[PDB]
């Protein structure tokens, strides 16, 4: 397999790298021969895995996940490790936190959390059905089309651990829970801290060196809303997604069938408002 | 050319090679615009409001002289971009690459005994003199020691007074590689707020020993999230061999102590049987001479 994927030159090029480091050696690439985008991620390959490759081809079909394309090994030096191309499609509008860094007062219309939320719940629902936890819910990793469409990326369950603000209480170790815990419930609470960060536009404890935040989200109540202005469904929707102990937490189905996410006679007039904001900028 | 300000950095420096490799921290090779000589310039695009926060932490800097073990910090500068304008921090230029390079190109991935005593002793002595100046350098592995072609040994400083190429960009926010960290930096239920220390850098230096001594550090086959939770909980870890001498075991447990207040100074580790009594000394730098040449070709 691996040694059967041909060398990218003269169908995708590198164009630049997006994201400016949150996720890596991504590169906005091209199609050679149309012109059409793509987002290329690029590693260096050392590493019959290569099963990344098997998640993304069986599981990123799905409306509310960004699509697969196909793979490329680079050829390398005697002499250098090769360079592998995942090739994914691309979300041009960009990611739902920059949309709410580039909102006056970092916050978003509460009908369009409710959208945005529910295309979410949408591509993790597809997600837990097979069995794969994304694991890494953040606004970071919700991205949108210039179609105003959502699409998760960046899934599948390395040696870096990222930014710990959205993480589940469960998924981190300590003395009373040793084994830390990834259940698809984990994805749900990373979900409502990524609908308080559309609501206030930072996750909670924000402020906290990394570390901290590691270390106080297990020790912590369940996480608010800061001001009083939202809905009572909205409220009760974060209050659904953060149930502390996770053996408690709705499940994906019956988060999607909370009013807040359920009850949305403003899609229509909401995905228009979306696109309008997208070119606006 | 001044540590205690961010200036643009046209007729100082400039780059040699193109910015394909992405701005977030990526190094690439430079000039000095006067002098002709070779730098290592860190490049990350900053926000306007990162750029504040860059004055500060410079105002944080700490003074501290040229030094052979370390690879010198030549400054901080900003360059504009379309009215994201870009970071760089620019470093003495070491073409031999890293020590995690020179495990890699080497035989079954483990470096003898005496190489791994001299390596150690010269990132000892680096930090001596950070540490004398009252800074910590808060990152040595492998990666972050690096060979000149004259086989010296240096450690990699980006301005590790104030941090700037950890505290800036877009994934400052990460809590990082786990495997280098000593117990008082991880949060923890007997250790609620991390205390950075000097002994911190010892800690990491034999965990750097071991890198040196298998190609890879303790814990290396877990996920990091529970390498991190190991880490404080855990005795603290040991050579898988046997084939070691009574010397470097007993460094690694002087390294190891797992509580820093109990961690001996950096002086008192210099002093260590396995770091002063080096009768191969001479050898072993021709060896690294050899070494570096065959490896470029
Ligand atoms: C123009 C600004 C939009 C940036 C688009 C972008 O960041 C995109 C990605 O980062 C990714 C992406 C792909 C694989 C991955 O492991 C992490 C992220 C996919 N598609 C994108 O469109």
Redesign the pocket.
Known sequence: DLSSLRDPAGIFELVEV??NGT?GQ?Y?GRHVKTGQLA?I?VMDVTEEIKLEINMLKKYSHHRNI?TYYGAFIKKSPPGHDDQLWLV?????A?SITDLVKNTKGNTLKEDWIAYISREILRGLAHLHIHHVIHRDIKGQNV?LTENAEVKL??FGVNTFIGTPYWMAPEVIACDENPDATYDYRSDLWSCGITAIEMAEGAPPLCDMHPMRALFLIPRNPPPRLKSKKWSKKFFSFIEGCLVKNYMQRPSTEQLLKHPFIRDQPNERQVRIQLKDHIDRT
């Open positions: 997006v994201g996720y991504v906005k987002a991620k960004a994914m499609e691309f979300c041009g960009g991205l990326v960046d």
